[PDB]
């Protein structure tokens, strides 16, 4: 099936000080985890840089793509101090 | 890949009376059904119990967990009498 | 898994006049692309046509069911000239 | 991904009988079941028809494409008596 | 998709040894990786507990379902000792 | 789910001549084709290179991971003349 590309990503960086759900909805795919609701975010990075359908493929540095949504739930909740996402905006 | 768990589950149980779309538009992945949309139901269950994103992963004794869309879907759209659904909010 | 039916689809044909992101967000899913968002469409076709969570099933000949993300993201990359789509509205 | 092709199908029927198993060992894939092993000397249309490698594409009945192994698995538990499947032979 | 059984599970426990290779050829699926082809004679519990076509459902500890094939293989190469795993038979 | 490996890939290349199978049964997954089961003098480098269990991810230049069966069945069929392939050999 040729025709195959990127899926161009961009960081998102915050601090998880305890007291704080990431705000973040979720939905599994094969590549990573659509961001299904983003209230108003707690982080320049999601406030400034997230938004609805937006897709997080990375997550700490273990990449999403093919794991279980089980599994990336618990990596998410368990996010405690400096939390990195890599995140792609599907709008071809 | 180590960390993997639950995704809590509450129910929404209604009552089938003919001459209701269950409001619910769907979107088929690996674990379940994802709400799209949710007219404000006709449903205390619903109305009261479901928003968008939110993921249904059993109807009437069946888990959608792995099921073809085309299957899901004909289960929804056999609904008569006696609905009864298990639900997780994926928000870690 | 007996029941197992359709998908009803319809179609969606516009003209890729360059200088206009067909303004679809997308999302991979089995059975092909969950429409994430949709900005006030610049197609008759979009605009009276698609909402937001709708499923593009064929791009252009091409059935998106079952391609890597990778893949259909290109497909809508290089649509130029007549673009036709069939998409299937999930609402049991 | 243009080059999609619609797979030859041939059918094999028989009449399954207590104490006498299938004698095929099953691997789950998207479009069906392949025969990872099989024992000869079970059934005359097995010995005649199937061969390692094959994939059983629906069995009595329902198509196998997309479902849990889980389901695939008890649909073929479940036959007492007549049996009548669909398969491919993926020799390109 | 009524018909779901719950799958036959067995151990398998040994004791890697360096340069005895555990001699199992594994195709990944999604309830875990399928024993495509297996050399007989590198240790006595696999002698005496299985054969082609087996499931390796979890490998010490972590359940291989929906596990992306190069997160399962990790698991594998990574262990230099201790081995247990559960696996099924899948003969209908 | 931490561990995750690149897998390592050797090269098949080979010249299809008219009357002449590649004798592979295939079986689709997640990163590629399994080779279930191959018939030996067909081809050298087949004879030299691949044995039962390997997985052909890459076929004439177009990456195997993700595509349905229908397409990567279509690709081997469609090769009359050179055939490159890209393989891993399975066995952790």
Do not use: H, W
């Not at 961009?10 to 795919?29: I, Q, R, T, Y």
């Not at 093919?66 to 990336?72: K, T």
């Not at 739930?73 to 405690?80: E, I, P």
């Amino acid at each position: 099936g040729i025709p195959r590309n990127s899926l161009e990503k961009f960081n998102v960086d915050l601090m998880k000080k305890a007291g704080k759900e990431l705000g973040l909805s979720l939905s599994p795919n094969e590549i990573g985890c659509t961001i299904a609701d983003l209230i108003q975010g707690q982080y320049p990075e999601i406030d400034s840089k997230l938004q609805r359908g937006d897709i997080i493929t990375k997550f700490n540095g273990d990449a999403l793509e093919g794991l279980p949504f089980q599994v990336s739930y618990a990596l998410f909740k368990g996010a405690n101090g400096k939390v990195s996402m890599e995140v792609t905006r599907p709008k071809p």
